Paper text:
CNG channels open when bound with [name] and conduct Na+ and Ca2+ ions into photoreceptor cells. The gating ring transmits [name] binding/unbinding-triggered conformational changes in the CNBD to the TMD, where a cavity gate formed by two hydrophobic residues in S6 opens and closes. Cryo-EM structures of the [name] [name] CNG channel carrying the analogous mutation, R421W, show that most apo channels are open. R421W disrupts this interaction, destabilizes the closed state, and stabilizes the open state.
Given that the R421W mutation appears to greatly attenuate [name] activation of [name], we at first hypothesized that either [name]_R421W could not bind [name] or [name]-bound [name]_R421W would be closed due to mutation-induced defective coupling of [name] binding and gate opening. To our surprise, [name]-bound [name]_R421W is open and its structure (determined at 2.9 Å resolution with C4 symmetry) is identical to the previously reported structure of [name]-bound WT [name]-425. Comparison of mutant and WT channel structures shows an r.m.s.d. of 0.62 Å when all visible amino acids are included. The hydrophobic cavity gate formed by F403 and V407 of S6 opens to the same extent in the mutant channel as in the WT channel, and the CNBD and gating ring in both channels have the same ligand-bound conformation. These results suggest that the R421W mutation does not markedly affect the process of [name] activation of [name].
Author numbering:
A (entry chain A): 101 to 620
B (entry chain B): 292 to 438
C (entry chain D): 292 to 586
The structure:
């Protein structure tokens, strides 16, 4: 199967628009998050691979009555009068922390294999030419060599941390785990993964707050590693700002100095500094003053940016209710200033209660000013399919009439007891019933002739031009909404555009209009 | 749905909005007070200087009796300083108190930034008509001063 | 005027804005450092625990030498904590120090609230296009979640938005449309689409005034793959010139292809030109169909 794998990888070419490639970008995002967190943590907190040095506390012995420099216990790292000295191991801890180091180098090799498969997919990456991906190997390899992505992938895969990033006991090399910031250079695949994840998500604001919580945790973790690197570079326990025994917030009474204590106090210090609460010990030396001043101003600027984005994100979770209540505050302030009647005030308030309870606000502005009219007409014929399947001017005629008219229909919500049409008024519109029930009544409002249900067409007698009766532009009947009624309103101009283009719908409309006008 | 229908039907909508967000603030500080005192009594009261007890000395100073009212009053004050990130409370000692205070301070940063941003928008929209009016008149006055 | 002309001419305007406001912050904290140390040496150094000196113990702790660098470093740190209102500095003692700290903390509240509000707006407008894009897509997605739209059409809309963000073909001509003059708009639009409009036979076999007239009335519309731009039953109000993409003139079965349409091809004009010689008139005479994504 070696020739199967060899020839399959020989003319393999990746489509970047697939879902499987998006899952691969999520895998590269996981590898990048690994590189970020654990490379700065393994550089600063160097006991994460094994301590590689023996801690030596001074201990007043109870038998020999003298101080000895024995190895520290957890009871001797508690309540310290001085920080322990670290005698170097002869094998640099490789005889007893080899399981931790092989687990770390296994995950390093795993994410480097993820980077190798990612740069192979970059080497065979299809690209849009005329709206279609090119998917034969020669053109995509030459487009890869023309684009300097080989430079970006080749800087990002230098294995300098496999020779210089580990404790070598022979040359007494301490190790430099900071040499995987070249693996941190590949940020663009992660940014495209987060953009494609925010595009495809059904819960976008939840994804946004998860991403900014991850940003906050990564920033506080990196500042924790900077604080502990500056603390161990100055020297631990040398003053009251640096981590150590003189700090007394870092190591209080009955608190053991462990690696967990170091990371936990550094994360807490960075949480108080970056959020500028500042309930941490004051700096002593001038370099600590410079670092705390720079780090507090970085905390002010970038955490003001971050929580402003957080406040905007949890503000836009209720933007529709905020716009709705801004409109209703405008209507209510206009009605309070103008001394409008209380019956009409509660009619407007109950109309707004129906529009929020049934969610029938004008939401077609979004598709109207973003989407193309071929996608708008397909969405509008998708949503109102059960309503427009009942319409006799649409289902007894050509589909081009419905495709023309489905974007010119406007949804208008009427209160119960509202007169949509009455005989004295002039008519510029027709109405198709989306929801609701109506009644054709007399001028007394008691006698009902015919009811109108969902899918009924009315209001066309005024805007169709029949010279056979006395009315003309007048409404010929009194329709009245029984309950709340949504209606597909259509102008006289848009109807007569689609009727001048489509003649058979014009013949059916004028035929049934003259038929109801001549029995009426 | 009751709060939405009450904000719909109200003749004083911004007063109802600030009453609802003051109730939200009081419920959140009360729930964090109960979380702080549950973690204090789970760790054990008076075992260190962060937990409520005799070693705290902000919770129980001199000539202050340990009562149930004192427990709720100190827990409500601690949550008021932590969620608003003033932070004039004793520092954590054990690692679980550091983890709880770090998580609770970041929850305070995020959700109280959201809350007071909503409060500032609510008491900004009490004068939106005067603000739009004076933005228009500032435009007219700057055009007349330039020309 | 130098800072305004530098922000005008810059290719990186937001980086220049954050450099200018970092310089403003450093100048303000430096001037307040000089005010704090002038009031400290006017009251007299080391006279109480608020003034710089030996009684302060934040200014001069144990094993810390009193130097000029120490004076400027502690004054800059004091002004950084006061103007950002962290306030982890010693409390005032005398009434003049209370008055100075109250006035300086309120100046810090007001002018640093102004400053970091400007900073938050500046690093918010570094991603204003992505924010407007995702506000539009949140509107479309909430409308499709409320209205029970089909999943095929939902992923068609989502893939259309993925193509508009990946290829950056959003409607960016609104900026030049409502800011720039039409002589500069037509020169930019004939600069950008020169390789496309050099392939157009109604523009290159005729006068240049026609292209100069029509180049601002052209609108860029992006179509999905498999979309029918024209088919025979529909009426036509528009013509189409291919900016990008490939199309195919197909039959009603969608299998047999007559002629393909590449970049610079002109189609859709038979419906809107008025020829009385054939039976169609306002009807489309053929079925065109997008192969891939088509501008
Ligand atoms: C586990 C810690 C168990 C020992 C406790 C301890 O304490 O760990 C420390 C530090 O080792 C570590 O954390 C190594 C952690 C290695 C983690 C490996 C995971 C790699 C994968 C990363 C995740 C990526 C996911 C994707 C060992 O130091 P020690 O016990 O030998 O010194 C104490 C000796 N006295 C008592 C005499 C003083
Ligand atoms: C997280 C691991 C939590 C383990 C808690 C139990 C350990 C324990 O309990 O063992 C600790 C020993 O610490 C250890 O070496 C265990 C190793 C823990 C390593 C912590 C450093 C992690 C840094 C990695 C970067 C993380 C980035 C993510 C972004 C936030 C003893 O605990 P103690 O101090 O109470 O000993 C009182 C006697
Ligand atoms: C509120 C009740 C205020 C009563 C004040 C007089 C009591 C007094 O005065 O009696 C207290 C005794 O406390 C008590 O057991 C009275 C019970 C108070 C319960 C407080 C806990 C309430 C928790 C309920 C949750 C509330 C949620 C609402 C959201 C904020 C003595 O007062 P002392 O400490 O000065 O005794 C010095 C000798
Ligand atoms: C900045 C210069 C940094 C030099 C650091 C090494 C000096 C050193 O290291 O020499 C210092 C001596 O101070 C000095 O007179 C050097 C003069 C430094 C002047 C600092 C005041 C500058 C004010 C100018 C305004 C700046 C406005 C810009 C806006 C921020 C000794 O240092 P030490 O305190 O550790 O002596 C322990 C024994
Ligand atoms: C502005 C204030 C700058 C003052 C910094 C300064 O005085 O330098 C002191 C440090 C001391 O180094 P160490 O004791 O941390 O090893 O020496 C350094 O090497 C720090 C220089 C880096 C800046
Ligand atoms: C991140 C920092 C995590 C460190 C937490 C830890 O060390 O666990 C200690 C607690 C102690 O329990 P107790 O003394 O409060 O009863 O033990 C626990 O049970 C707490 C674990 C819950 C997390
Ligand atoms: C409001 C609070 C005002 C109180 C200020 C006051 O009492 O004046 C005291 C200062 C003392 O001067 P000096 O000791 O700093 O040389 O005398 C002054 O000269 C300060 C006056 C400037 C204001
Ligand atoms: N006059 C009349 N109108 C009816 C009848 N049934 C439905 N209608 C509709 O009621 C509508 C009222 O407004 P129009 O006169 O424009 O058009 C009328 C018809 O569309 C009927 O039986 N008689
Ligand atoms: N009928 C027909 N139309 C073509 C042909 N080649 C290109 N077209 C274009 O396809 C278009 C479809 O819409 P129109 O009828 O408006 O205009 C048509 C022509 O512009 C062809 O060979 N036959």
């Amino acid at each position: 199967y070696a020739v199967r794998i060899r020839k399959y990888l020989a003319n393999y070419t990746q489509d970047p628009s697939t879902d499987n490639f998006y899952y691969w970008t999520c895998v590269v995002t996981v590898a990048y998050i690994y590189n970020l967190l654990f490379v700065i943590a393994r550089q600063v907190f160097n006991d994460l691979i094994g301590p590689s040095s023996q801690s030596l506390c001074r201990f007043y012995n109870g038998t020999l009555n003298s101080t000895t420099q024995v190895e520290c216990t957890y009871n001797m790292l508690t309540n310290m009068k001085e920080m322990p000295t670290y005698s170097q191991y002869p094998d640099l801890g490789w005889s007893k922390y080899w399981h931790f180091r092989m687990l770390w180098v296994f995950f390093d090799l795993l994410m480097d294999c993820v980077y190798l498969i990612d740069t192979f997919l970059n080497y065979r990456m299809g690209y849009m030419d005329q709206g279609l991906v090119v998917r034969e190997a020669e053109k995509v390899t030459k487009a890869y060599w023309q684009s300097k992505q080989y430079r970006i992938d080749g800087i990002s895969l230098i294995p300098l941390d496999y020779i210089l990033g580990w404790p070598i006991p022979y040359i007494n090399w301490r190790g430099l785990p900071i040499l995987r910031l070249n693996r941190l250079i590949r940020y663009k695949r992660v940014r495209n993964c987060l953009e494609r994840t925010e595009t495809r998500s059904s819960m976008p604001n939840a994804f946004r707050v998860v991403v900014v919580v991850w940003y906050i945790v990564i920033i506080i973790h990196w500042n924790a590693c900077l604080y502990f690197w500056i603390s161990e570079w100055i020297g631990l326990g040398t003053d009251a700002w640096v981590y150590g025994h003189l700090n007394k917030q870092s190591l209080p009474d009955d608190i053991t100095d462990t690696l967990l204590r170091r990371y936990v106090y550094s994360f807490y210090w960075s949480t108080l500094i970056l959020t500028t609460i500042g309930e941490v010990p004051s700096p002593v030396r001038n370099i600590e003053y410079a670092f705390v001043t720079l780090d507090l101003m970085c905390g002010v600027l970038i955490f003001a940016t971050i929580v402003g984005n957080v406040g905007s994100m949890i503000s836009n979770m209720s933007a529709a209710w905020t716009e709705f209540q801004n409109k209703m505050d405008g209507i209510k302030q206009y009605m309070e200033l103008r001394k409008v009647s209380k019956q009409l005030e509660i009619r407007v308030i109950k109309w707004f209660d129906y529009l929020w309870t049934n969610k029938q606000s004008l939401s077609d502005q979004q598709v109207l000013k973003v989407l193309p009219d071929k996608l708008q007409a397909e969405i509008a014929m998708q949503v109102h399919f059960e309503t427009l399947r009942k319409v006799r001017i649409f289902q007894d005629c050509e589909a081009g009439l419905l495709a023309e008219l489905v974007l010119k229909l406007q949804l208008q919500v009427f209160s119960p007891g509202d007169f949509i049409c009455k005989k004295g008024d002039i008519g510029r519109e027709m109405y198709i019933v989306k929801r609701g029930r109506l009644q054709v009544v007399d001028d007394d409002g008691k006698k009902v002739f015919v009811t109108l249900q969902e899918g009924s067409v009315f209001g066309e007698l005024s805007i169709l031009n029949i010279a056979g009766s006395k009315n003309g532009n007048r409404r010929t009947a009194n329709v009245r909404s029984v309950g709340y009624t949504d209606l597909f309103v259509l102008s006289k101009t848009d109807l007569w555009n689609a009727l001048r283009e489509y003649p058979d719908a014009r013949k059916l409309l004028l035929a049934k209009g003259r038929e109801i006008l001549k029995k009426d």
